[PDB]
């Protein structure tokens, strides 16, 4: 006979002891552990609500991968690369580039907890977390690898994080701030309550809906399998948060979660926003970006945070306005500066698409539509010099993404600036400035790509010099219009 997990589980996490040959603070230094002075014994009440154990883990994960790889093998010849819309192919290129090696970095956030958390159940769940993120990094390298032979842009599934390309710096600044650059308990509440139960659901399930509509079942099946692991290891957050609140650290926990949500928001507005509302073919848009935000981030995620005892973030109303506006401008920035991307952005502004945009975002045509009108008329008249840039956008010193606002008939743009230690910084929101001021030692001597350009680090100091600095190795690798401007024929 076998004995049921409930009867031996407590022994698997009965692993705290009172150190004697080194001190408690030597074994769990605050800078790596983040215990905020809470004594060891208090962490023993930590109770992960989504458990697993070693024999079940290896059996269950063996099955998850057998399915994911079988589906991929059975569909190699479904012609996705060949029959897919190029906007869809660009969605794959930007996802794998922005995510694969960041997943592998996430192994280190889980490892930080496995070694430095004072809660024994957190150290074990984070051990499975390490394994899960290894899975995620390896799957999201293996899957795009077959397309290296089709298109050098797929090299960026591996290369992006090794580059200084601007969107890669935005991803790394986010990942390194929330996952690899902080103590264990900060990872436990920041990573789980920004990406893992929040925006991961946009990029791995909202996008899976669009992938299924687009007939790309290898990808939909992959990313939804990945999210099944997330939904287990993210449940390390709740008990950590509860323990902080119980031990008088509510203020600190709220601030960390508020900071992480906003940081994740800005990165996924540039990644996921243009994918959902422009690159994905119109017929395949299951919901708009805003509708998916209201389902996943407002309806599910934020409601869960309130249930666990946090308040709505202070910037709630700013955030709601941003969901209506920000990604439309980020899309326009990525498209106009497409040569700086490793994917080929789709403009997404044929008349039928603009009708959908107007339905999903009333007022769109009198705002962003004004800019696209200029662009469209230039393409129709073959004034292509006017559809490519000759300078750089100004970039946020927090999110590392261009400073934008609402264009057109009720133009409104605001940069939130800050002098600090003799330097002038610029941010794209009140919140981004607020994040900096919470922890300047984390950020203060970081230089964004435009800071580097102005400081002589990018030679020659030209657009072409910046592209070379960004790590492009051939003309083919730089972004172009997904459809080679064939869309203007519909205009």
């Amino acid at each position: 006979a076998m004995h049921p997990r409930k009867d031996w589980y407590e022994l698997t996490r009965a692993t705290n002891w009172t150190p004697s040959y080194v001190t408690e603070e030597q074994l769990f230094p605050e800078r790596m552990s983040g215990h905020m002075g809470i004594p060891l014994e208090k962490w023993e009440s930590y109770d992960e609500p989504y458990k697993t154990s070693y024999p079940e883990y290896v059996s269950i994960q063996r099955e998850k991968d057998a399915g994911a790889y079988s589906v991929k093998a059975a569909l190699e010849r479904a012609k996705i690369y060949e029959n897919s819309d190029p906007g869809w192919i660009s969605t794959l290129k930007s996802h794998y580039g922005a995510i694969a090696v960041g997943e592998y970095a996430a192994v280190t956030g889980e490892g930080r907890m496995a070694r430095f958390s004072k809660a024994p159940g957190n150290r074990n769940m984070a051990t499975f977390g390490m394994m899960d993120e290894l899975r995620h990094g390896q799957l999201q390298l293996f899957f795009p690898h077959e397309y290296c032979k089709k298109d050098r842009q797929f090299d960026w599934a591996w290369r992006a994080y090794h580059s200084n390309e601007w969107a890669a710096i935005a991803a790394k600044h986010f990942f390194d701030d929330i996952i690899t650059g902080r103590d264990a308990i900060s990872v436990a509440i920041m990573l789980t309550f920004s990406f893992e139960t929040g925006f991961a659901n946009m990029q791995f399930l909202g996008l899976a809906a669009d992938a299924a509509e687009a007939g790309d079942y290898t990808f939909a099946n992959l990313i939804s399998s990945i999210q099944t692991d997330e939904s287990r290891h993210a449940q390390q957050g709740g008990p950590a948060l509860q323990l902080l609140i119980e031990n008088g650290k509510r203020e600190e926990a709220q601030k960390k979660v508020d900071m992480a949500i906003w940081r994740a928001w800005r990165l996924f507005a540039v990644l996921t926003g243009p994918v959902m509302d422009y690159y994905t073919p119109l017929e395949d848009r299951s919901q708009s970006f805003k509708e998916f935000m209201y389902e996943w981030i407002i309806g599910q995620f934020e409601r869960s945070l309130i249930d666990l005892g946090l308040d709505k973030p202070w910037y709630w109303d700013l955030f709601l306005k941003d969901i209506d506006e920000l990604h439309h401008s980020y899309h326009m920035g990525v498209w106009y500066w497409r040569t700086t991307a490793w994917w080929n952005p789709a403009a997404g502004v044929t008349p039928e698409e603009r009708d959908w945009l107007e339905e999903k975002y009333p007022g769109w045509n009198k705002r962003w539509g004004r800019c696209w009108d200029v662009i469209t008329e230039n393409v129709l008249n073959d004034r292509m010099d006017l559809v490519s840039p000759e300078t750089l956008p100004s970039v946020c010193n927090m999110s590392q993404i261009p400073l934008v606002g609402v264009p057109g008939d009720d133009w409104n743009i605001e940069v939130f600036s800050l002098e600090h230690n003799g330097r002038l910084y610029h941010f794209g929101s009140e919140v981004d400035r607020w994040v900096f001021q919470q922890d300047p030692v984390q950020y203060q001597n970081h230089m964004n790509i435009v800071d580097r350009f102005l400081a002589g680090q990018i030679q020659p100091m030209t657009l072409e010099g910046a592209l070379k600095y960004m790590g492009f190795q051939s003309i083919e690798e730089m972004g172009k219009d997904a459809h080679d401007f064939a869309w203007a024929d519909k205009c």
Binding site: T12, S20, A114, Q138, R152, H173, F175
Partner: protein
């Protein structure tokens, strides 16, 4: 900008003469944090974690110009690890099932339950320390191929912890008056036979240089556990009519040998740099006395 055609694999692998393997494709050259010496992470260069990495990874006395070229001799990836370990772990769980059907635990020699309570069930603390320690070497190591071996070793440490938890509980059902599942923390903290091991691990867990952590854990502590804990327990189990524990330990020893294999391959890679021989030997000599003392104290408890 020149024009270049598509490559059959990643640009960093495209000069290989061989076709890249699954292992090469998914494991190699993934730590971007080693690219910029003054900024491991994409933050202020003097952020706390950047300072940690510059001190305890970049500044380690163990040095190599191409740590990324290290190769796990077993070439394991997540997929093939879970295939391998589902096989081995299914086998162990089937042993547990059948030996329980046969009432194995009832037939052990008189008093063996007390030896297990004193000498076996507190191993869950030792094995968790190996788990914590392996996770530290993972997060600090200067190449993703090294860190991957460490992730899998962290998981194996938890495998061993979980075996020990399961068997401690199971043994307590036949022998409810031996403190099984009840006193292990106090033994780990206060029993002399455990104090050498506890001192060894508390000090090893505070060795933060990546190279020192690796050598102390994998070249000194873990081979000692094989020679002085696993094998002597098998021998004592034989003398005491416990036929399950030797089979369980043989499965754990397959994992332990695998940890030794990758470790030795890392030492071989390291030694391409002549300066590393002195650095590794120095750390081996520093940690060996604490490991020898730990072994002696444990063995005197086991035979008492």
């Amino acid at each position: 900008f020149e024009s270049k055609k598509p490559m059959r694999t990643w640009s960093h692998l495209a000069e290989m003469r061989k076709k890249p393997s699954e292992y090469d494709i998914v494991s190699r050259k993934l730590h971007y944090s080693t690219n910029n010496p003054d900024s491991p992470w994409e933050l202020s260069p003097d952020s706390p974690m950047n300072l940690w990495y510059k001190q305890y990874r970049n500044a380690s006395p163990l040095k190599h110009d191409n740590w990324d070229a290290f190769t796990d001799p077993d070439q394991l990836v997540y997929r093939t690890y879970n295939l391998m370990q589902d096989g081995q772990e299914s086998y162990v769980q089937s042993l547990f099932d059948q030996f329980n059907e046969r009432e194995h635990d009832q037939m052990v020699r008189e008093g063996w339950e007390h030896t297990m309570a004193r000498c076996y069930s507190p191993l869950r603390y030792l094995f968790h320390c190996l788990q914590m320690s392996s996770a530290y070497v993972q997060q600090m190591a200067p190449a993703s191929t090294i860190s991957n071996c460490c992730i899998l070793q962290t998981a194996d440490s938890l495998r061993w912890l979980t075996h020990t938890a399961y068997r401690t509980h199971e043994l307590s059902l036949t022998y409810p008056d031996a403190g099984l599942g009840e006193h292990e923390r106090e033994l780990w903290e206060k029993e002399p036979g455990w104090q050498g091991l506890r001192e060894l691990m508390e000090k090893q867990l505070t060795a933060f240089d990546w190279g020192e952590a690796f050598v102390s854990l994998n070249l000194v502590v873990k081979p000692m556990i094989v020679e002085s804990i696993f094998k002597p327990l098998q021998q004592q189990a034989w003398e005491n009519n416990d036929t399950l524990l030797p089979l369980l330990i043989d499965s754990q020893l397959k994992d332990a040998e695998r940890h030794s294999r990758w470790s030795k391959a890392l030492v071989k890679h390291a030694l391409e740099n002549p300066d590393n021989h002195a650095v590794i030997e120095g750390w081996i000599e520093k940690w060996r006395p604490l490991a020898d003392r730990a072994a002696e104290a444990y063995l005197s408890m086991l035979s008492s």
